[PDB]
Amino acid sequence: KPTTFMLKYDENGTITDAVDCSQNPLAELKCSVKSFEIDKGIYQTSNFRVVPSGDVVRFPNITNLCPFGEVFNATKFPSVYAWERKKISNCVADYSVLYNSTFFSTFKCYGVCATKLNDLCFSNVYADSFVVKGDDVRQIAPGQTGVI
Amino acid sequence: DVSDFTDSVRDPKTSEILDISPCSFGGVSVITPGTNASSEVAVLYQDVN
């Protein structure tokens, strides 16, 4: 088993004695003071915790899925000077269809890691859609410069 | 050693154990009578042969 031991080497370098350090409170005391003999007294050795005994998951009453397909696979996209805002709310979102495909050239998330997006929940999501030049996609980032 | 220093080694040709010790180091102290008195000084090399 994975345990901690304390070994006692002799002046000639062989192990002559040891203590198993999780057998007793006295053994943990001997580990803490690093000695085989203890004087009388009271000694602080460690800290105790109580292990959790259950699991509570609590999420709202949401049943509908929400239109990622009707945002991405859309026929008409507007200009970059006149972009459009769409609100996604009251849905169960998957997010695996975004990072499970090689369809996107640029996929960069600010503030979050991608695979963590499936466990945590939001209030509502806002989507902005436009068509931009080839070399201007690096200007769509916080703290950038350019005409866009 | 207790501070993860190697203090002995085994020779990879003759299989002989050799102890390693640091080269001698320490502090240097200067003893002066004062500048207005003289310009001679004495030097103490601390804890050395």
């Binding site: 088993k1 994975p2 901690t4 304390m6 002046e11 370098g13 040891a18 | 002995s8």
Partner: peptide, 30 residues
Amino acid sequence: TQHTSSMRGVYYPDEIFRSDTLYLTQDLFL
């Protein structure tokens, strides 16, 4: 039947000489 392992199954943890100390180690022990 079942017996008890009274202070048995201690091995040298690594290939390092040590002398006249007490050494704490954490590994897979009996």
